[PDB]
């Protein structure tokens, strides 16, 4: 399960590093790949944090829509599940990640970048909720991880038009945290996880989990699940 | 039938409330937002939508004679109408726009937050103005304000009741823009005319799922989003 | 009774913590929160609350010395005594302003942001501390810090548990005044006062609304909005 898609490890953090020339444009193997990469780096105690990376050049266009072209529904239905399971996993893996953003991220490339617990941002990047273009709409939660962020009126205005925005628009909007030269990107990315690399792992994964929790379940539910990791952390 | 009207144009309605002198909504007025939001919808002849009270006001809000003179059960109706039409119009599957002139002031304020986006004049009055009537806004107003604005703020701002201007309602996020008084209609025609060449049928999936957001359990989220894009798809590929 | 005092005066109470000498927080001051925040909903004399810890300081957190000497099952009620504190400091049913002088850290921050609003020292220092116990923030403060501020900032300052400036709060929205240290419980006090004269019931109904939107699923909140929205016209209440 790694032909686009490798973990590289290096001083104590991660590089999950996905490689599909030109554009990275993710197709369903590219998906399942990212799923055993979250799951490989979650479990991996050489790991402390994880910089999501697509090279110097791009990030990621988005889904793949030649192959996506060729699909039946079933087929389709299918790769809109494993999508989810794909940005679901990079959201949830129990370690501080960034996304090291240059180029583009475009569509469920964009998504995938706010996967990342943050991102740092080329100043040149060019970024869009794409679909609408291919007459589709957003998959993998991109619709709601993108309106938490902006609101709805900017949320539509941005997937109704498909339009691109830059970075330093997106830093504006609060959808990128810092932005920087081309060449430096992936450097700051790497600078930003180390600053986790001297905390405690298990504390670091149970406030990830509550904090990924609040617009997700409900409030008895948080409560529970925050009292639980707390105990935990304690008791250890 | 009798205050609010649809008007078609060019592949563009605009729906108007009109009972002056401070388009003043009461019960009957929701229900005729309803039928308007519900006929927008359907018709083939609209691409986008205005939402527009006339060069003079766009409400503000709730008719407080009727509301002052009801009784829990007809508090409850009043409250029931009052949130269908709120919806409705937020559920219109095309992009809406509001025009908003003069006055938006309680439910008034909460309509005008029901459309997609919102164009105001420059020398608007907002205000969640039903605590000086010794009530609360309706229609899921504190959500939809809060949602936009923060705990802190809507607080700050329902329970004074306080008119503010269009400038903090633009540094707000409120509004999304912000022109003279007597060219917020012509700014809002040509917003909405922006989408009148979009793909209908994906802008409604689109817009459906952005609303679910705050209104979904996230696994009905997931499962609607999966269901929608599919259908996207599949009639695209047949025709 | 012996950390939290209640102050009155012409319809303005005041909620004062005092424990030197950081009003550290231990499992009593919080059952002494929960009594104190139920007696203030329960009078109907008072219109408005301020929450204080002194000109000193607001709170160190929770008290890490009693937190040590505690096995998980206590532990785990201790955690869950502190939610009660906060939760019954945050629906008192009036307008309530945390007066925050010194610091305001871990569960500090968490009981500051409780209040409806915040003024704050300049020279005040925040922080989620939490992490650096080892720990993580109790009392549902990761998902009130996560309200105003977003996943990704929330993410910084709870996985860092650094120190941040009156400065900084104010620029993320996490208190909503910054004035001089001298000035900061006046200043909350003529905020507060601002509210005396709303009708109170609709004060009360609007909070419990507010405060709803990012605790009850969807249906739930139609359904308590509407009841409480009905309640202002019932024969008892009008």
Redesign the interface.
């Given at each position: 399960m790694n032909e686009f898609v490798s973990v590289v490890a290096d001083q104590g953090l991660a590089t999950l590093v996905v490689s599909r020339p030109p554009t990275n444009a993710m197709t369903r193997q590219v998906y399942r790949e990212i799923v055993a990469a979250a799951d490989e780096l979650g479990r991996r105690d050489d790991i402390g944090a994880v910089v999501l990376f697509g090279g110097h050049e791009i990030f990621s266009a988005g889904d793949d829509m030649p192959e996506?072209?060729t699909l039946?529904?079933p087929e389709?239905?299918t790769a809109?599940?494993v999508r989810?399971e794909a940005i679901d996993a990079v959201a949830a893996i129990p370690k501080?990640t960034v996304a090291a953003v240059t180029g583009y991220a475009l569509g469920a490339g964009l998504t995938l970048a706010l996967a990342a617990?943050?991102?740092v941002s080329g100043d040149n990047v060019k970024f869009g909720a794409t679909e609408?273009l291919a007459?589709?709409?957003?998959?993998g939660?991109g619709?709601?991880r993108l309106?938490?962020?902006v609101?709805?009126?900017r949320?539509?205005?941005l997937?109704?038009?498909g339009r691109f925005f830059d970075a330093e628009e997106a830093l504006a909007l609060?959808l990128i945290?810092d932005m920087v030269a081309p060449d430096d990107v992936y450097d700051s990315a790497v600078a930003w996880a180390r600053?986790?690399l001297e905390?405690?792992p298990r504390?670091?994964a149970?406030?990830?989990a509550?904090?990924?929790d609040?617009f997700?379940?409900?409030?008895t539910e948080?409560?529970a699940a925050?009292?639980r990791?707390?105990?935990e952390?304690?008791?250890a």
């Open positions: 996506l072209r039946n529904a389709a239905d809109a599940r989810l501080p617990d943050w991102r609408i007459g589709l709409i957003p998959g939660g619709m709601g309106t938490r962020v609101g709805s009126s949320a539509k205005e997937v109704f038009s609060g945290d600053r986790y905390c405690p504390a670091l149970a406030a990830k509550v904090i990924n609040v997700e379940l409900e409030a948080r409560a925050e009292r990791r707390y105990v952390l304690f008791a």
